[PDB]
Ligand binder design. Structure first.
Ligand SMILES: Nc1ncnc2c1ncn2[C@@H]1O[C@H](COP(=O)(O)OP(=O)(O)O)[C@@H](O)[C@H]1O
Ligand SMILES: Nc1ncnc2c1ncn2[C@@H]1O[C@H](COP(=O)(O)OP(=O)(O)O)[C@@H](O)[C@H]1O
Lengths: 159, 261, 444, 68, 176
């Protein structure tokens, strides 16, 4: 689990972190409940960070995942489906719906914020190609957000 | 590789047991043609097939002919030539020959004699104990030699399937064995006809009388029968070959094999 | 397999018919047991023909005395006793296959599944698999088409298809299972099986109703989700068959369908190659689809679909045969989906042809040409640019677009110098030409 | 582990049996056995694949009970 | 290689039936080769003279070659066992090449028992290397099947010391 944590913070690759987290959970198989919960949470977080939520459904449908199912696990599944939908708004909705369950600063809040920034950047870049000059309130209307936050994100990207 | 695909027209030159040839082709060709489907669905293609009939119908002849629909290069490898020294490192030679097949990817390794004289003398149980069987297990674990990728099969042309290490007939092993024995009367007359094909003389088509005297004679022996008929005619310096020449040849070969057995 | 030790041909010949007479109606099981003992003796003697004859006689007795349950447990015991002789059990299964097909009955489904369980212990490619294939097909016919047996025939085919196929029987079995798969309306697995089987071609040169049947089952599978280029490809692959079997109605409707589809396909270099290859067909001229293709293929015409629905839309109402046309657009739900597909397809076609003609076009004119409003037009423009098909830059506050890449001064002066050198070469050529014509003209 | 759990190996594969061989099997051979999970009939790896990997290219050396 | 033997058939004898048999099997395929050609039967090539020494195999072979008036190549079998890897294989290859390049020849290989073992493998030795040479000879036997020329004559004392691999219809067949 600690090796997976270190690699997830390193952020060069997340598949090895997935391997380490799964090994830690397999060690925590119905032995230490909180450590198992943390291991599976980190495993699913790095799995969605891999931008492959399609295997998330199978992973959470696995027997051990159902055995250790919980509100935080369901929140992570909702985050995975938000990543599927590519909706930063849906991701933010899931985070607010389970905030305290995913408010943890160590590799939970940090990685969720990083992924949220990734979706913001991807949405902006995906909608920005056609426009040689576009009004930012129209951009905000397309992204379904306010003006100040969209402007701040576009700035921080372009600075 | 010494023997290659060209000259593969023996599908008509075998004559006998054409149904047996068809069955062996049905077993062999499809994985040899399109092995990718086997990987695509997740099933292992067969490795080869076993052949009986120690002196009988040409097992090597079948090996050549069946590759007609295969467009592959049959290789005549001897078990002793593959094992060389009596060490488990004999797998080096099998590695070399399998690399040769891999280079000439459409290939079929035809084994010469694995159950050394299955009719008599020393079998797998006698003489070299388990050396043959371990060397065969080497080619057995070779089965992961990229069967999907590699168009290589192995036919085992044993003499007698009696002492063949039944541990080598399980699934994943050699598996399929096709029965070949001494040709029946129908196969015998057919192979007599094909042997006489190249011979154009007066004679007659009285093949059944020849069959009656020459029953239970192997295909090679019948080829020798036709050659002996030609030899009798040329020793007489006669440009004609009649049924009496065939009678003399059949009697000669029958007496020869009767004395030798 | 193993050498025969003690034959009992005389014993079976002298006793088996007498046993059949003694148990003509099968009320006696001591007869069955004593023939079991006899075949066990012949099995320990390693005789195959006698055992096969005994098993065939036993199943024949069960047929004539119609004891279906006792048949089921009897054949179970026969197949499970010690495995016996593979030749003999393959035989017995073959005559069971021959028998189960003649009596309709209710529990022949039970007979079929019983023999399936007896043969599914393995030994499929070896010692007869066509029996199991025929039993699965018989189960399909008994259940009259459903999802469970369709999945069964899906999961059965592969082993025998890979091992020992038949250039007609096996491919017909594949065709008879894929149609059930499509009736189940599974798309991923039906696509998988279709793409894994279609690699086996070069028999369709002698097809009667096989390649066309395969293709007309896979048409729905492809066109169900998003396919439009493979659609035209295999519609022309069914078009080239009436070329060797010239039948006018199917030939002409295939022409109509392929001409419609190849245009309807999304723009690409391959689609261009197909449309240019299709155009110029001598046999294509006598249908309105000829005019449709000639108009809608090239020369960058304004494809106002509102005009087209009456100029070349007569195939929807009435044409020569109008059957592929009614299949495509005359349908209600899928028909309206394909109508919308024509609508957008022509929208992107107009955008593309405008790209190579107009540098800056006003938003109102572009929207009017696309038969949509400003927001819809800009949405489709974004859909093209995210696909990188067009080099477009738009001012949204001004609503003005540009299609020309900003010319770097390096290559700008480079093309200027190339223009200069072209002019210089023209000066040289004109000088030589005029001087020499001057010589010929003052030769007087 | 390099190949993430041998590319999603099954649980019932553990190396406790095929590793306590006392049969040399240099790290190169270990890597070759690991890559001998190339049996793509299925998307996972079973203990049979490891058994075949150990069976291929091996020399029989045993008999520690006399020394212990 | 003797360019031409001059020993005559008359100075040898005793086994006249066997000598006439092998004459019909070898020399006749040389002089009356067109006879076999028009008949359609390809003459056999492999003739194995087995018998104790002093029985005249060498003289008979050279006399047969002289009667054929064709090229004769003698192989010293017992010294074909060379330590060099594939050395015997190369010797046999180029011997067949020379015979092919020079007329329908007589390849008189002596000590066939020395060349081929009966596969009586033992701990002392097992005919590991010489099997390469035996297989090379076997594969060279089929080179001259068309235009049936260059005959193979192998001399030994005991035929039984050979495996049932050299004995075949197209291979060594005429065991005299
Ligand atoms: N059915 C047959 N038809 C034609 N020739 C045959 C037949 N069977 C054997 N032969 C001849 O026998 C020779 C060698 O046969 P071989 O493969 O040694 O048979 P086996 O292995 O049963 O002894 C070939 O040259 C072939 O011409
Ligand atoms: N029939 C014969 N007539 C004359 N000399 C013979 C005859 N048979 C053998 N010899 C003598 O034997 C010698 C050849 O011996 P060798 O060729 O070694 O015998 P083998 O061929 O049986 O091994 C010759 O020098 C020859 O003089």
């Amino acid at each position: 689990m600690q090796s997976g944590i270190i690699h997830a913070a390193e952020e060069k690759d997340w598949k090895t972190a997935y391997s380490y987290f799964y090994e830690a959970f397999e060690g925590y198989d119905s032995i230490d409940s909180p450590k198992a919960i943390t291991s599976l949470k980190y495993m699913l977080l790095c799995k969605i960070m891999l931008n492959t939520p399609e295997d998330v459904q199978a992973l959470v449908s696995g027997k051990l995942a159902l055995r250790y199912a919980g509100r935080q696990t369901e929140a992570l599944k909702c985050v995975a489906q938000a990543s599927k939908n590519r909706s930063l708004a849906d991701f933010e909705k899931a985070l607010t719906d389970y905030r305290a369950e995913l408010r943890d600063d160590p590799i939970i809040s940090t990685h969720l914020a990083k992924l949220y920034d990734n979706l913001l950047e991807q949405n902006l870049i995906r909608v920005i190609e056609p426009f040689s000059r576009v009004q930012i309130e129209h951009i905000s209307s397309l992204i379904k957000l306010s003006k100040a936050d969209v402007e701040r994100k576009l700035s921080q990207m372009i600075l | 590789m010494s023997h290659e695909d060209p000259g593969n027209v023996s599908y008509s030159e075998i004559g006998g047991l054409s149904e047996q040839i068809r069955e062996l082709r049905e077993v062999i060709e499809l994985p040899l043609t399109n092995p990718e489907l086997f990987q695509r669905v997740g099933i292992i293609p067969p490795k080869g097939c076993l052949l009986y009939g120690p002196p009988g119908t040409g097992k090597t002849l079948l090996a050549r002919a069946v590759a007609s629909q295969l467009d592959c290069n049959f290789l005549k490898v001897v078990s002793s030539s593959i094992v060389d020294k009596y060490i488990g490192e004999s797998a080096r030679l099998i590695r070399e020959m399998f690399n040769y097949a891999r280079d000439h990817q459409p290939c079929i390794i035809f084994m010469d004699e694995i159950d050394a004289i299955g009719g008599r003398r020393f079998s797998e149980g006698t003489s070299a104990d388990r050396e043959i069987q371990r060397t065969l297990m080497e080619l057995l674990n070779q089965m992961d030699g990229f069967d999907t990728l590699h168009r290589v099969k192995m036919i085992m042309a044993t003499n007698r399937p009696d002492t063949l290490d039944p541990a080598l007939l399980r699934p994943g092993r050699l598996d399929r064995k096709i029965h070949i024995d001494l040709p029946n009367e129908q196969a015998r007359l057919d192979i007599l006809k094909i042997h006489a094909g190249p011979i154009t003389k007066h004679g007659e088509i009285d093949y059944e009388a020849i069959v009656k005297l020459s029953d239970g004679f192997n295909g090679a022996d019948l080829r020798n029968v036709c050659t002996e008929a030609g030899m009798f005619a040329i020793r007489a310096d006669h440009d004609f070959v009649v049924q009496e020449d065939f009678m003399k040849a059949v009697r000669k070969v029958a007496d020869s094999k009767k004395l030798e057995s | 397999i193993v050498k025969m030790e003690v034959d009992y041909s005389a014993t079976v010949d002298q006793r088996l018919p007498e046993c059949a007479k003694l148990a003509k109606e099968g009320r006696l099981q001591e007869v069955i047991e004593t023939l079991l003992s006899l075949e066990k003796q012949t099995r320990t003697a390693s005789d195959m023909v006698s055992t096969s004859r005994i098993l065939v006689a036993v199943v024949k007795m069960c047929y004539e005395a119609k004891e279906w349950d006792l048949l089921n447990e009897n054949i179970m015991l026969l197949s499970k006793r010690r495995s016996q002789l593979k030749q003999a059990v393959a035989k017995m299964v073959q005559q069971c296959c021959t028998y189960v097909e003649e009596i309709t009955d209710l529990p022949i489904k039970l007979r079929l599944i019983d023999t399936l369980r007896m043969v599914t212990e393995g030994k499929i490619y070896v010692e007869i698999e066509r029996a199991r294939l025929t039993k699965t097909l018989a189960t399909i016919k008994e259940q009259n088409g459903d999802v469970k047996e369709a999945a069964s025939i899906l999961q059965e085919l592969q082993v025998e298809t890979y091992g020992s196929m038949e250039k007609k029987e096996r491919v017909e079995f594949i065709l008879e299972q894929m149609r059930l798969c499509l009736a189940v309306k599974d798309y991923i697995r039906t696509q998988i099986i279709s793409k894994k089987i279609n690699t086996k071609f070069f028999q369709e040169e002698n097809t009667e109703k096989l390649k066309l049947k395969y293709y007309n089952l896979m048409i729905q599978l492809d066109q169900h989700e998003g396919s439009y280029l493979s659609i035209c490809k295999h519609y022309r692959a069914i078009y080239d068959t009436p070329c060797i079997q010239a039948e006018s109605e199917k030939w002409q409707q295939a022409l109509k369908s392929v001409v419609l589809y190849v245009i309807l396909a999304p723009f690409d270099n391959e689609q261009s190659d197909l449309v240019h290859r299709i155009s110029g067909d001598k046999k294509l001229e006598e249908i309105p689809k000829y005019k449709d293709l000639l108009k809608l293929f090239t020369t960058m015409e304004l494809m106002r679909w509102s005009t087209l629905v009456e100029d070349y839309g007569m195939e929807l109402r009435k044409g020569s045969l109008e059957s592929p046309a009614t299949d495509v657009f005359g349908s209600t739900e899928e028909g309206e989906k394909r109508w919308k597909d024509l609508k957008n397809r022509v929208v992107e076609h107009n955008i593309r042809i405008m790209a190579k003609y107009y540098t800056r076009i006003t938003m109102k004119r572009m929207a009017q040409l696309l038969d949509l409003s400003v927001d819809e037009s800009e949405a489709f423009l974004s859909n093209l640019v995210v696909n990188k098909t067009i080099f477009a830059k738009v001012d949204r506050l001004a609503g003005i677009i540009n299609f020309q890449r900003p010319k770097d001064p390096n290559n700008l002066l480079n093309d200027w110098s190339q223009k200069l050198n072209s002019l210089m070469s023209l000066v040289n050529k004109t000088t030589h030409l005029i001087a020499k014509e001057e010589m010929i003209h003052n030769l007087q | 582990s390099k190949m993430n759990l041998s590319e999603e190996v099954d649980l019932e594969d553990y190396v406790a049996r095929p590793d306590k061989i006392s049969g040399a099997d240099i790290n190169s051979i270990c890597q070759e056995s690991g890559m001998l999970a190339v049996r793509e009939n299925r998307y996972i790896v079973l203990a049979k694949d490891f058994e075949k990997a150990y069976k291929t290219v091996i020399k029989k050396d045993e008999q520690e009970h006399e020394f212990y | 290689v003797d360019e031409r033997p001059t020993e005559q058939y008359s100075d040898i004898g005793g086994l006249d039936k066997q000598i006439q048999e092998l004459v019909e099997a070898i020399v006749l395929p040389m002089n009356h080769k067109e006879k076999f050609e028009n008949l359609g039967i390809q003459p056999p090539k492999g003739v194995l003279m087995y018998g104790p020494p002093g029985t005249g195999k060498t003289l008979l072979a050279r006399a047969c070659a002289a009667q054929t008036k064709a090229t004769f190549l003698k192989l010293a079998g017992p010294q074909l066992v060379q330590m060099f890897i594939g050395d015997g294989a190369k010797l046999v290859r180029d011997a067949f090449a020379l015979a092919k390049e020079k007329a329908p020849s007589i390849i008189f290989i002596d000590e066939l028992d020395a060349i081929g073992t009966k596969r009586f493998d033992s701990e002392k030795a097992g005919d590991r290397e010489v099997q390469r040479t035996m297989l090379e000879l076997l594969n060279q036997l089929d080179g001259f099947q068309p235009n049936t020329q260059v005959k193979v004559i192998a001399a030994t004392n005991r035929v039984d010391i050979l495996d049932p691999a050299l004995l075949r219809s197209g291979r060594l067949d005429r065991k005299i």
